[PDB]
Amino acid sequence: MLDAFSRVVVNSDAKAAYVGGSDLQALKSFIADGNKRLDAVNSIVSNASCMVSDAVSGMICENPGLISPGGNCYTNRRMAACLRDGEIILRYVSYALLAGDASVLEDRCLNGLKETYIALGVPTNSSIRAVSIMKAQAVAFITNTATERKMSFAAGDCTSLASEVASYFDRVGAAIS
Amino acid sequence: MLDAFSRVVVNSDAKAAYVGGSDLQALKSFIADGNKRLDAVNSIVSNASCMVSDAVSGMICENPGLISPGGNCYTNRRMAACLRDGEIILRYVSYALLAGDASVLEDRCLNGLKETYIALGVPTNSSIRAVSIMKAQAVAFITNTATERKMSFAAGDCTSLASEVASYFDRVGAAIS
Amino acid sequence: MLDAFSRVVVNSDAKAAYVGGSDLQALKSFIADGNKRLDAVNSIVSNASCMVSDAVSGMICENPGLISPGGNCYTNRRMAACLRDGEIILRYVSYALLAGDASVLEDRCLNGLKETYIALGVPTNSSIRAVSIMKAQAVAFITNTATERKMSFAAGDCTSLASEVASYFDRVGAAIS
Amino acid sequence: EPETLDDAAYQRYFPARIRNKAPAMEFRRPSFANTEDPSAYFMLQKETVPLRMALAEKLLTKLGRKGDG
Amino acid sequence: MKSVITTVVSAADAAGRFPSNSDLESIQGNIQRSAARLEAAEKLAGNHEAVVKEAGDACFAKYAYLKNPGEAGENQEKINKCYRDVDHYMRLVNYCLVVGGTGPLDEWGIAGAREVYRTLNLPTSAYVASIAYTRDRLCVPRDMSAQAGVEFSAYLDYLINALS
Amino acid sequence: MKSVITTVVSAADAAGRFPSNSDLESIQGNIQRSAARLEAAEKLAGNHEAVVKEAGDACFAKYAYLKNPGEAGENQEKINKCYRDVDHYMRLVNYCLVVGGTGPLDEWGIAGAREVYRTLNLPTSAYVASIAYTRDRLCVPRDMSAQAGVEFSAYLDYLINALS
Amino acid sequence: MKSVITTVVSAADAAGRFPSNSDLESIQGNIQRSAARLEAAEKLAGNHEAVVKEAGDACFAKYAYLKNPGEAGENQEKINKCYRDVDHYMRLVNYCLVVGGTGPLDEWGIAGAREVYRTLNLPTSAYVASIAYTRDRLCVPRDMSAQAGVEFSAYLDYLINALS
Amino acid sequence: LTGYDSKSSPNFPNRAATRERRTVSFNARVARNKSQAKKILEKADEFFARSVTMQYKAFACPNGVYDIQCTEGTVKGAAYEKRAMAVSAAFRAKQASPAAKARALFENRRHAIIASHECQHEEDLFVRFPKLSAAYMMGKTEAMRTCSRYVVPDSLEEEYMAASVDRQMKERACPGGVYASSCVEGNAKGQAEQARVAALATAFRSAQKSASKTTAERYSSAAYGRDHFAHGCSYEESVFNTYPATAAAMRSKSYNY
Ligand SMILES: C=CC1=C(C)[C@@H](Cc2[nH]c(/C=C3N=C(/C=C4\NC(=O)[C@H](C)[C@H]4CC)C(C)=C\3CCC(=O)O)c(CCC(=O)O)c2C)NC1=O
Ligand SMILES: C=CC1=C(C)[C@@H](Cc2[nH]c(/C=C3N=C(/C=C4\NC(=O)[C@H](C)[C@H]4CC)C(C)=C\3CCC(=O)O)c(CCC(=O)O)c2C)NC1=O
Ligand SMILES: C=CC1=C(C)[C@@H](Cc2[nH]c(/C=C3N=C(/C=C4\NC(=O)[C@H](C)[C@H]4CC)C(C)=C\3CCC(=O)O)c(CCC(=O)O)c2C)NC1=O
Ligand SMILES: C=CC1=C(C)[C@@H](Cc2[nH]c(/C=C3N=C(/C=C4\NC(=O)[C@H](C)[C@H]4CC)C(C)=C\3CCC(=O)O)c(CCC(=O)O)c2C)NC1=O
Ligand SMILES: C=CC1=C(C)[C@@H](Cc2[nH]c(/C=C3N=C(/C=C4\NC(=O)[C@H](C)[C@H]4CC)C(C)=C\3CCC(=O)O)c(CCC(=O)O)c2C)NC1=O
Ligand SMILES: C=CC1=C(C)[C@@H](Cc2[nH]c(/C=C3N=C(/C=C4\NC(=O)[C@H](C)[C@H]4CC)C(C)=C\3CCC(=O)O)c(CCC(=O)O)c2C)NC1=O
Ligand SMILES: C=CC1=C(C)[C@@H](Cc2[nH]c(/C=C3N=C(/C=C4\NC(=O)[C@H](C)[C@H]4CC)C(C)=C\3CCC(=O)O)c(CCC(=O)O)c2C)NC1=O
Ligand SMILES: C=CC1=C(C)[C@@H](Cc2[nH]c(/C=C3N=C(/C=C4\NC(=O)[C@H](C)[C@H]4CC)C(C)=C\3CCC(=O)O)c(CCC(=O)O)c2C)NC1=O
Ligand SMILES: C=CC1=C(C)[C@@H](Cc2[nH]c(/C=C3N=C(/C=C4\NC(=O)[C@H](C)[C@H]4CC)C(C)=C\3CCC(=O)O)c(CCC(=O)O)c2C)NC1=O
Ligand SMILES: C=CC1=C(C)[C@@H](Cc2[nH]c(/C=C3N=C(/C=C4\NC(=O)[C@H](C)[C@H]4CC)C(C)=C\3CCC(=O)O)c(CCC(=O)O)c2C)NC1=O
Ligand SMILES: C=CC1=C(C)[C@@H](Cc2[nH]c(/C=C3N=C(/C=C4\NC(=O)[C@H](C)[C@H]4CC)C(C)=C\3CCC(=O)O)c(CCC(=O)O)c2C)NC1=O
Ligand SMILES: C=CC1=C(C)[C@@H](Cc2[nH]c(/C=C3N=C(/C=C4\NC(=O)[C@H](C)[C@H]4CC)C(C)=C\3CCC(=O)O)c(CCC(=O)O)c2C)NC1=O
Ligand SMILES: C=CC1=C(C)[C@@H](Cc2[nH]c(/C=C3N=C(/C=C4\NC(=O)[C@H](C)[C@H]4CC)C(C)=C\3CCC(=O)O)c(CCC(=O)O)c2C)NC1=O
Ligand SMILES: C=CC1=C(C)[C@@H](Cc2[nH]c(/C=C3N=C(/C=C4\NC(=O)[C@H](C)[C@H]4CC)C(C)=C\3CCC(=O)O)c(CCC(=O)O)c2C)NC1=O
């Protein structure tokens, strides 16, 4: 919808004023790591076959009662539709990363999930345990400290990149609370 | 080409790569004191099978309660899994000498070893006592001050790399401390 | 649909062969002139509303019978439908210029258009002069020879696309008449 | 074949696959000093360290007692 | 509002997938133009209060039939509010140089403009005069660089091709 | 073909509009990326027979059980088909570098490959183990640039996270 | 769910007519298998506890191969988990042969089955070695009459024609 | 070379004079050998129009059981009048205006290319066969419940957000103050109210979906109007993202409704 290029134009529509050399310097630094942002989504799309897979096993090996008789993901009609519930939130977060803001995420998908989840009976309590399994593996692939797959990048600092992806997943728990 | 060397280990499936006569000069121009370095890591991997045998047996020789019934060096498949693991540190800290940095040692080998060993019933104070033998064994091979067998090198000093591997074994020791 | 990069591999797919340095150099010169190609389609979109409003009276200045009662171009609606007819077949040739291949207009605009004009009684002797009038204006913009408009371009020759733009115009009237 | 042994307990630490996997390296130095040698070559092949039951028997029997629990 | 990289992700969920490898090739290209275009935004920024009154009375120098009553341009505060109506068209044409695309243009300058200019009888030919009055004097090596000089006018004639 | 040129004209066609300059930024990103992408494809056209043989030897090294009867490698004529099945991938990986997008891959090789592999009892676990050996032992300064070793290797793991 | 009753009761409502006399003829055909099919349900319900072992051990003889690392059988877990896995499919043939249709299987067993096996890498060709072993085991003189041998053996062949 | 020469075949089209001939002999000589492929590609696209209308009913009948979506009857013989009204109007829509002929064609060759999400084989079929693209839309837009009969409001305001757009959507029906023949109730003495009596049955029981059937249809309609009308109109997407019945009642075709 609107990007980080437009995020200062969000404010500038209600200024009765413009954006010039007062706010370009906050956008000038976005170009200086514009190679870095395009280099730090190339890790996220590189393991799309291990982002939604180990997430849903991360809650089975902690709370295994969800596949018990009396479960929400009991049969294959439910849990194959759980891996589609957990993949499209990896989809609308990677659109938000190239935009620099959650304007794609917070209106296309997460605009009121507490009338599609409490209307179904989905367990919200271990949905957020299914969130931080992917967040802890998102910051672990931003850095090259993943114990399985190393990635060849140009050297430099990406703590501003690693802190930003944690600050995308935080409002997911807010959208279900 | 150390980043391409790092992708042989970190990529979570076994590959193979080797270095001919042309690109051996690429490694000597890349790594500082590499003729001292490749002599050092050759003098650990050539005698590692003797090095794991004295490391577990000195743990028995100063603590003979491991081979007691109910002990953790009882029931010889369990005793074989020490001898599997005892070179796995020496496979990886030789690789820490080769890359010049213990980042690949940390996430692939040291990460999670503290919680694994209390899950299985490993006595951790003997586990530091096993690796401290291997810390003392490598610096007698790098400095060639080993009592039994000696190796052939061009003359000079290698005490910087002896201190460099001594900064790698306490990373194994403080991970399981 | 099928752009220039897709065209060079779809006639090489029936080869069951790779695409090496025999025809990539003809494509490497296509991306050399790509800066001049974006410096060609800019000269068409910038002057759209003049040149569509141009020929609709430039057609009837030669043939005044089209505004006569019982005319095809006689009323307000049949002209208002003619002007919105007018830039469709020129926005599609701009697509062919920006994508380097004529495979977007001859499947979405020349896909049976002589079929529909016979169903309405639209004349074709006028519809090919009404695009040849709008053809010479397209070579007098990519080559800066307009007499009331000047685009500041660098020093270079534009006969590379002068016949090629008209190549996307003579195929129009041939397959609608 | 291996077996299983898998009390999912370190399951989520080392996984089923990355378990006892390690590098392995070989060194052939040049033959004479300060001359270029085409025969000098160096492996860095990743290889899974096996269980090694054979020298496990001769080390337990030489040190303590039976080991047959 | 459609810019360079909010469009290619509006089509990336339109198929229901992830970003591709060519999806990142698009985002490199505005980085090639996020220096040559942001100088053109700065030239409008520190000169906008000079060009509102410059091209403002330009159109009043064209149409003498507004200067007599029978129009909405009789008294002074209409012409003061006319110079307000200039300032909105420079507020959002400055915005598009920041984001790269024709995003802010199509929303509140292009769409819906037909009703409140034709039922309100304020002619679109009177607007395109002062739009072209900014466009017919681009001093290319003086005010900006050579590449800002060609794309600043390319946003200027967008309201030309739409409204007239 | 899903290339960056097609994705910006298909959204241009759907809106009933002209080619706007917002898409022209994405075409500028091609000619910057095209030189660091074609020589990944030019080196692949001169090395394809030596890389496809060296790939399938790790397919049978990681899973040596396929030589059993009833599997997909019991006789010589379908082990010959295994090298043909994997050469067709590494030709479509060459085809998609020249286009720049993922166009030929997800349409020719990928779409419909799931419901025929489990049909003829072919695992995809050995298919992804063939290219992951190819994608790993390739030193980014030794064979090509530091950019083509990023972009081309971004196409090989596109298969792995679409097959798994 | 699918049965003799619920299938034919649908077209009465979905065409908006009464219960016919042709659907009354259809439940009469369910009486002719009611004392002919339900003997196999009480057969296996007191028989699974020994055939969950010998048909769970049946696939690993074919695939000793899955067992080692990088695959489906990596650890015990799938099987202690793996034996629980196969005790859900013929747990449903006790649910399918008691109802009269494939209702408990086409909505609980195959729906979404190929999608949780591609992502979680479970080889579908070992379930073809798991319960079709019981098809090659079944003795019509000793175990149960040839009416179960035409109906219990039929419902298994529904499943191998579904997981392939 | 084959023989002493290679002349063209007399079975090739456009081989005779057609200069000063009679009307009977002019038309016989322009359609000489073209009649076969015109009738080959006439039964081709009619089979395509018969094939995709089958492949979307498989979702309507999952695993061999009929859902509440079929429901062509509610009272005794409540499909006989629905039989006539569906097939008599199909002739009424085949005697339309000659402006709406290609308006149907070129717009069916617009929306289907959008909905076929980048599959080059599929857009090549939609350009040659206009009957296939007329059947691709109404099959998929009824498979995913998006048109008019299943997107019921849940708030109180959405009944006027429906009512604001539809009577403004029926600017397409009435050309001026006259009506059209494309929007006709029926033509029998009861068929006017016989269209109403089914029209309340089909809205009522379709408001009795499951919790999964409404929560999966309230996002499929949102992205439907997000790539058919509001390609960049973020204000229209500001009602299309949270209020899906707005994003569903507006129909992508010039249906003359
Ligand atoms: C409960 C059951 C269970 C699993 C199924 C696995 C899966 C798994 N892996 C990680 C943790 C991780 N997971 C990955 C994932 C991958 N690496 C790749 O190359 C692939 C593309 C992808 C797998 C398909 C990476 C890179 C890390 C960080 C490094 C590591 O911890 O190994 C986590 C994070 C823990 C958390 O939630 O906080 C989980 C659940 N581990 C478990 O405990
Ligand atoms: C079209 C496809 C496309 C891509 C795949 C990326 C690829 C990419 N990454 C970087 C370049 C980079 N990427 C990183 C990022 C990192 N380095 C690390 O060691 C960290 C692990 C990680 C942070 C998360 C850094 C630090 C640079 C160098 C540039 C900089 O420091 O700003 C560059 C710049 C190099 C150059 O221009 O010569 C490019 C092109 N960009 C693209 O346009
Ligand atoms: C166009 C695609 C393309 C690739 C991705 C690479 C992949 C590749 N590498 C090698 C060939 C090789 N690859 C390596 C591996 C490496 N080499 C080193 O210097 C490091 C140690 C390590 C990378 C980090 C070695 C050592 C050889 C030579 C064979 C050998 O001596 O063992 C070969 C066979 C060619 C030969 O005969 O040598 C191929 C196809 N080459 C290509 O043409
Ligand atoms: C029963 C009681 C018992 C022990 C207490 C230990 C004896 C022992 N030896 C070494 C010490 C060592 N062990 C080796 C290992 C080797 N030397 C070689 O030449 C071979 C290649 C290789 C296997 C024999 C080396 C090189 C040293 C250091 C130098 C030395 O003391 O010999 C150490 C570590 C240094 C220290 O004392 O802190 C110990 C604890 N082994 C036992 O069995
Ligand atoms: C008797 C009826 C009659 C007319 C109404 C005019 C209209 C007209 N203009 C051009 C021809 C043209 N028309 C344009 C268009 C424009 N020129 C500009 O400077 C603007 C940017 C833009 C209008 C907004 C251009 C660039 C040419 C080519 C150069 C020229 O001959 O003027 C042609 C084509 C001549 C041909 O067929 O070859 C016609 C018919 N001429 C006539 O004979
Ligand atoms: C995003 C929008 C976008 C554009 C509009 C173009 C803008 C553009 N055009 C040219 C550059 C050029 N443009 C032309 C074109 C012409 N010269 C003539 O004499 C003819 C009238 C006309 C032919 C069609 C030529 C000849 C060059 C010089 C480069 C070359 O010759 O390859 C350059 C390179 C010069 C520079 O870097 O300053 C740029 C950036 N590029 C973009 O990225
Ligand atoms: C890939 C990386 C990798 C490693 C870092 C090592 C680490 C490691 N060690 C063991 C597993 C083990 N490690 C030991 C070792 C010991 N116990 C003691 O009491 C002694 C102090 C010490 C011997 C000197 C034993 C005994 C087991 C087996 C536990 C058991 O069988 O109960 C396991 C088993 C669980 C599993 O398979 O995941 C792993 C991962 N092995 C690897 O494959
Ligand atoms: C690929 C395989 C490969 C190797 C294994 C090394 C082997 C090696 N090292 C050195 C050469 C050397 N090697 C050492 C190393 C040592 N000397 C000591 O006294 C310490 C005990 C020990 C360090 C642990 C030193 C100090 C030199 C001389 C300085 C130097 O060249 O680095 C030389 C040059 C000899 C000559 O001039 O002819 C060679 C071939 N180099 C290689 O290319
Ligand atoms: C309540 C939901 C709602 C919609 C989905 C659209 C749908 C829609 N668009 C138009 C009509 C139009 N719709 C647009 C579209 C836009 N105009 C812009 O300035 C934006 C950039 C873009 C999204 C708002 C344009 C430019 C026209 C005029 C062209 C035409 O009539 O087709 C009309 C008929 C004219 C009228 O509105 O009276 C309708 C019903 N309009 C709506 O009221
Ligand atoms: C951000 C957009 C922007 C512009 C495009 C300019 C446009 C512009 N130029 C002038 C002002 C002027 N403009 C010119 C014109 C030119 N000068 C030359 O060297 C060329 C021959 C020719 C350009 C084509 C001259 C000669 C003056 C000053 C003297 C005068 O003519 O009044 C003025 C009046 C204010 C002043 O005195 O400067 C304005 C608004 N200013 C802006 O803020
Ligand atoms: C256009 C792109 C294109 C492809 C991707 C392949 C896809 C493909 N593969 C096979 C067919 C096959 N593919 C394999 C390949 C393998 N089995 C194994 O043991 C390994 C996992 C792997 C080799 C590494 C084998 C063995 C067959 C024969 C199976 C059979 O015909 O029964 C077939 C059936 C027709 C045929 O045999 O030719 C097709 C369509 N073919 C194509 O035309
Ligand atoms: C009621 C619905 C239902 C099913 C249809 C089955 C299917 C099924 N199996 C597993 C899960 C599993 N299934 C197997 C079984 C096997 N793996 C193989 O490689 C062999 C093909 C086979 C050996 C017999 C194993 C080993 C796991 C554990 C893998 C994991 O989930 O981590 C799961 C994940 C949740 C779970 O553990 O239950 C599901 C849904 N189980 C069910 O509960
Ligand atoms: C003026 C131009 C002109 C032509 C192009 C031909 C066109 C043409 N070809 C055939 C007829 C044919 N043409 C071919 C040719 C081919 N089929 C293939 O498999 C290959 C793709 C290709 C040649 C390599 C074949 C095989 C027949 C079939 C003859 C038969 O049916 O017996 C016929 C019908 C038989 C006849 O009328 O004699 C005609 C009109 N004739 C003309 O008069
Ligand atoms: C009469 C002509 C005719 C067609 C043109 C196709 C068009 C078509 N394709 C699919 C259905 C499909 N179509 C494709 C094909 C593709 N999707 C992709 O991801 C690729 C980009 C692209 C191939 C290049 C796939 C993969 C499916 C299954 C997924 C889905 O249902 O969308 C369906 C729905 C199937 C169903 O309802 O069960 C239809 C109507 N089918 C036809 O009957």
| Closest by Cβ to C24, choosing from F13, F17, F42 | F42
Interface touch F62/B14, C-beta < 8 Å: yes
User: According to DSSP H, which parts of chain C are helical?
Assistant: 4-10, 24-28, 34-45, 48-62, 76-86, 88-99, 113-120, 129-142, 162-174
| Closest by Cβ to F26, choosing from E2, E10, E29 | E29
Return all residues near F159 (Cβ < 8 A) that are at least 6 apart: F89, F93, F105, F110, F128, F131
**Nearest Cα to H151, choosing from H58, H225, H75?**
H225
Angstroms from F128 CA to nearest CA on chain G: 12
Round to whole Å and give the CA distance between D43 and D56.
Answer: 28
B4 lines ligand 3 (CB under 6 A): yes
Round to whole Å and give the CA distance between E29 and E14.
Answer: 22
Q: Which segments of chain H are extended strands (E)?
A: none
Return all residues near G94 (Cβ < 8 A) that are at least 6 apart: G41, G44, G45, G48
Contact partners of A by the rule of 3+ C-beta pairs under 8 A? B, D, E, F, G, H
Distance B61 CA to ligand 7 centre (A): 21
- Planar angle of CA B138, B144, B149, nearest 5 degrees: 90
Asked if B43 and B97 touch (Cβ cutoff 8 Å), the reply is no
Round to whole Å and give the CA distance between H143 and H162.
Answer: 21
Pairing assessment for the beta strands B18-19 and D21-27 based on DSSP bridges: unpaired
HEC profile of chain D: CCCCCCCCCCCCCCCCCCCCEEEEEEECCCCCCCCCCCCCCEEEEEEECCCCCHHHHHHHCCCCCCCCC
Round to whole Å and give the CA distance between E22 and F1.
Answer: 12
Name the CATH architecture for the domain at E1-164: Orthogonal Bundle (1.10)
Interface touch E41/A6, C-beta < 8 Å: no
Round to whole Å and give the CA distance between A42 and F151.
Answer: 9
Q: Does F123 reach chain G within 8 Å, measured CB to CB? A: yes
B142 C-beta neighbours (distance < 10 Å), count: 27
Mutating to test ligand 2, I would choose from E24, E27, E32, E34 the residue with most ligand atoms within 8 A of its C-beta, which is E24
Cα of H116 vs its chain's centroid, Å: 15
**What type of residue sits at position B154?**
A
Return all residues near G60 (Cβ < 8 A) that are at least 6 apart: G66, G67, G73
Query: Which 3 state secondary structure label does DSSP give A8?
Result: helix
Q: Which residue of E has its CA nearest to C49?
A: E161
Token pair, residue A1, equals 């919808």
Query: Which 3 state secondary structure label does DSSP give G88?
Result: coil
Token pair, residue H63, equals 């695993």
Round to whole Å and give the CA distance between E149 and E137.
Answer: 11
H in contact with D (at least 3 C-beta pairs within 8 A): no
Token pair, residue H102, equals 């290609």
Partners of G114 in beta bridges:
none
Q: Which residues of A touch D11 (CB under 8 A)?
A: 61
Q: Mutate which of H154, H155, H214, H215 to disrupt the A interface (most A C-beta within 10 Å)?
A: H215
User: According to DSSP H, which parts of G46-129 are helical?
Assistant: 48-54, 57-62, 76-86, 90-96, 103-106, 115-118
Round to whole Å and give the CA distance between H60 and H143.
Answer: 7
Partners of D24 in beta bridges:
D45
Token pair, residue A146, equals 């993943």
Tell me the CA distances in angstroms from A52 to A57, E16, G32, one per residue in order: 9, 16, 49
Asked if H108 and H130 touch (Cβ cutoff 8 Å), the reply is yes
C44 lines ligand 6 (CB under 6 A): no
Structural domains of chain B, ranges and CATH numbers in brackets = 1-177 (1.10.490.20)
Q: Give domain limits for chain G.
A: 1-164
* Method used to determine the 3D structure: cryo-EM
In this structure, what DSSP letter does residue A23 have? T
Token pair, residue C161, equals 């696309």
Interface touch F5/C104, C-beta < 8 Å: no
Distance G130 CA to ligand 12 centre (A): 13
Asked if H153 and H162 touch (Cβ cutoff 8 Å), the reply is yes
Length of chain D: 69
Partners of D27 in beta bridges:
D42
Q: Which residue of H has its CA nearest to C115?
A: H102
Only one residue has tokens 């171009």, namely: C73
Round to whole Å and give the CA distance between D2 and G64.
Answer: 9
Q: Mutate which of H38, H127, H131 to disrupt the C interface (most C C-beta within 10 Å)?
A: H127
D30 lines ligand 8 (CB under 6 A): yes
| Closest by Cβ to F98, choosing from C1, C2, C9 | C9
Only one residue has tokens 């796995």, namely: B88
**Nearest Cα to G106, choosing from A76, H150, D61?**
A76
Query: Which 3 state secondary structure label does DSSP give C103?
Result: strand
**Nearest Cα to G17, choosing from H61, H63, H80, H83?**
H80
Q: Does A95 reach chain E within 8 Å, measured CB to CB? A: yes
Mutating to test ligand 10, I would choose from E42, E51, E91, E156 the residue with most ligand atoms within 8 A of its C-beta, which is E51
Partners of D46 in beta bridges:
D23
Phi, psi (degrees; rounded to nearest 5) at H58: -65, -30
Query: Which 3 state secondary structure label does DSSP give H127?
Result: helix
Cα of H48 vs its chain's centroid, Å: 13
Q: Does B4 reach chain F within 8 Å, measured CB to CB? A: yes
F143 lines ligand 3 (CB under 6 A): yes
Distance linking the first and last C-alpha atoms of chain F: 23
Q: Under the phi-then-psi rule, with left for phi > 0, alpha for psi from -120 to 50, and beta for the rest, what region is C176?
A: alpha
Query: Which 3 state secondary structure label does DSSP give H244?
Result: coil
F46 lines ligand 3 (CB under 6 A): no
Q: What is the DSSP string of chain B?
A: -HHHHHHHHHTSS----EE-SSTHHHHHHHSTTHHHHHHHHHHHHTTHHHHHHHHHHHHHHH-GGGGSTTSSS-STHHHHHHHHHHHHHHHHHHHHHHHSSSHHHIIIIITTHHHHHHHHT--HHHHHHHHHHHHHHHHHHHTT--SS------SS--HHHHHHHHHHHHHHHHH--
A143 C-beta neighbours (distance < 10 Å), count: 15
Interface touch C48/E149, C-beta < 8 Å: no
Round to whole Å and give the CA distance between F109 and F114.
Answer: 10
Instruction: Give the full edge-to-edge strand order of the sheet including B18-19.
Output: B18-19, D42-48, D21-27
Q: Which residues of F touch B15 (CB under 8 A)?
A: 58, 133, 136-137
Round to whole Å and give the CA distance between H247 and A19.
Answer: 34
Return all residues near C92 (Cβ < 8 A) that are at least 6 apart: C104, C105, C108, C109
> Does the annotation place F139 within a ligand binding site?
no
In this structure, what DSSP letter does residue F100 have? S
Interface touch E22/F158, C-beta < 8 Å: no
C48 C-beta neighbours (distance < 10 Å), count: 20
**Nearest Cα to B97, choosing from C14, D23, G40, D33?**
D23
Mutating to test ligand 6, I would choose from C35, C37, C163 the residue with most ligand atoms within 8 A of its C-beta, which is C35
Asked if D45 and B13 touch (Cβ cutoff 8 Å), the reply is no
Q: Does E116 reach chain H within 8 Å, measured CB to CB? A: no
Q: Which residue of B has its CA nearest to A141?
A: B107
- Planar angle of CA G9, G12, G14, nearest 5 degrees: 105
Token pair, residue C67, equals 């505004």
**H/E segment holding residue F128:** helix F125-136
**What type of residue sits at position G114?**
R
Q: Which residues of A touch H211 (CB under 8 A)?
A: 119-120
Task: Report, in this order, helix, strand and coil percent for chain E, each rounded to 5.
Answer: 60, 0, 40
Q: Which residues of C touch F30 (CB under 8 A)?
A: 31, 34
Token pair, residue C90, equals 């020129």
Interface touch C18/F6, C-beta < 8 Å: no
Length of chain A: 177
